């Protein structure tokens, strides 16, 4: 589980003292989070699931 969305730090103060931190700017190309998993390993785990 990765997230190649590279974000900076933007702080805007709401009234006295209080600080709100939100997503700054994304550096690079636009892309999905990208979790990733194996194909065969899972298949192998599913093998005994369908059998049970």
């Amino acid at each position: 589980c990765t997230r190649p969305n590279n974000n900076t730090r933007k702080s805007i103060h709401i009234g006295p003292g209080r600080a709100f931190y939100a997503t700054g700017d994304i550096i690079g190309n636009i892309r999905q989070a990208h979790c990733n998993i194996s194909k065969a390993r899972w298949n192998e785990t599913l093998g005994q699931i369908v059998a049970k």
Partner: antibody
Amino acid sequence: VQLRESGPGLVKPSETLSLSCTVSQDSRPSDHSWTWVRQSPGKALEWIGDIHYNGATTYNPSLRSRVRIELDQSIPRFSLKMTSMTAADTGMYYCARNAIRIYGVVALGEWFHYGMDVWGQGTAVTVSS
Amino acid sequence: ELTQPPSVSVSPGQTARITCSGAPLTSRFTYWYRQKPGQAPVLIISRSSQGRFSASWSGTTVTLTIRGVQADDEADYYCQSSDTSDSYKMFGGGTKLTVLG
């Protein structure tokens, strides 16, 4: 980088065409795609195919019952089969590489076209019996 | 298939303008390329944002400017734009430019 075209440039009305093109040199010969171009005698241009090693069947649908694109695994030589329609527009046929340049290896994520960057010599295919 | 401009003359070392209209445009960018008389076509576009000559990504015509170059540039121009389902690229009735002098 280099492209050498082969095959007989003569076809009898209708019949079949066994057009060929060999890729001579490349640093990255798999990730990049492949396209065929139909140049009019002296008018315009027409798009053919688009073939990739993964078994991609992206092609010209205007002449869908005429398209048969060949991709050889060993060596980067490509072949094209023209069935039934050959005599309608006859002139020149060029072969060009369609660059991909993926930022991320995700096939659905960051794929784009740079266009037909590398073109070949181009052989003359004239149909008149 | 495509609404390609037939023929436009050159300005005397000034502003250059072309169109090429169609339905995709905002879908699969532009891509130009030029056919040299009796020679193999060559590169024009330098697409990377997901040389020399540039264009504006519009939904009307897109257009393209080749700077203030009068001579050294005269060939048959085209446009290759992919459909939403990667169907075809579509091309018009060619673009045969002419140089003055």
